[PDB]
Design a protein around this ligand. Sequence first.
Ligand SMILES: Cc1cc2nc3c(=O)[nH]c(=O)nc-3n(C[C@H](O)[C@H](O)[C@H](O)COP(=O)(O)O)c2cc1C
Ligand SMILES: Cc1cc2nc3c(=O)[nH]c(=O)nc-3n(C[C@H](O)[C@H](O)[C@H](O)COP(=O)(O)O)c2cc1C
Lengths: 134, 134
Amino acid sequence: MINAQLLQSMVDASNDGIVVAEKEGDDTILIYVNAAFEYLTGYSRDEILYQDCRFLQGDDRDQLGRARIRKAMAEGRPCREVLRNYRKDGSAFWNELSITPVKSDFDQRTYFIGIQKDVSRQVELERELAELRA
Amino acid sequence: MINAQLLQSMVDASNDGIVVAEKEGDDTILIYVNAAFEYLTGYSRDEILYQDCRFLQGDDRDQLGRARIRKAMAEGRPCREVLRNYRKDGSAFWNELSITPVKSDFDQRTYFIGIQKDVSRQVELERELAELRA
Ligand SMILES: Cc1cc2nc3c(=O)[nH]c(=O)nc-3n(C[C@H](O)[C@H](O)[C@H](O)COP(=O)(O)O)c2cc1C
Ligand SMILES: Cc1cc2nc3c(=O)[nH]c(=O)nc-3n(C[C@H](O)[C@H](O)[C@H](O)COP(=O)(O)O)c2cc1C
């Protein structure tokens, strides 16, 4: 279709937070993040890169999304889950995570492309509708 | 960060619908679409590719999203808009469109990366909350 350099620059430049990570045992290590992801998190490419993405959950580690994500990556099937995340400045938001497993098949490595959005307003709208139905 | 071939395969394989298009006057022509986009629309890469993406609106051409998208692409700034779209089988859904303008700067061409999601359930939840507030 298009040359891969063009595509990489279209991704580098996307308004959508986009990352790639590589499975290592019980971890997945971020090898690629775009600018919009740096803007979403309030971190820098260097701060972010080369660790597992969970670091954004911070203290708040009892969240059902985790298990559903973990369950889903394990089975090798895409998921979409929203977790509470925290920026560098400490502020808190609902991050929707779209995670897709990709096995290399050239080798035994598996990768994941994430695509993430601050969903905080969409959630507030639901908490409200939930209480109206009560 | 990562080699561009790896990245292109992570995109090719994403569960998220991702396209790229190229500005030509009042049009933008799709030069790249991934599999998930083919699945979103119910079209095939060959059917989809090489025309302007509006073809999915079909008959339903009076939609405010259009003007906001048009206004936004013009100004050269990202937007996120949801339009009513129609698959090949005719079925209808709410498609959220995240569109990012990218100028090449090597030449005078401008491109757009879109990232699109069936948002129909999130919308139904709002129509409901809207009427509760009435
Ligand atoms: C592609 C990809 C994107 C991810 N996005 C980040 C995210 O933006 N925020 C977050 O808190 N965790 C995110 N994670 C989730 C964690 O890295 C981790 O897989 C999850 O918390 C489940 O594993 P655990 O229970 O061992 O923590 C992402 C993971 C992957 C593979
Ligand atoms: C990157 C990109 C992705 C787009 N996504 C498609 C979409 O999935 N659905 C749709 O109906 N139109 C989509 N469009 C919107 C139309 O192609 C068009 O630009 C919009 O309807 C406004 O222009 P117009 O008023 O001249 O029709 C997309 C456009 C771009 C540039």
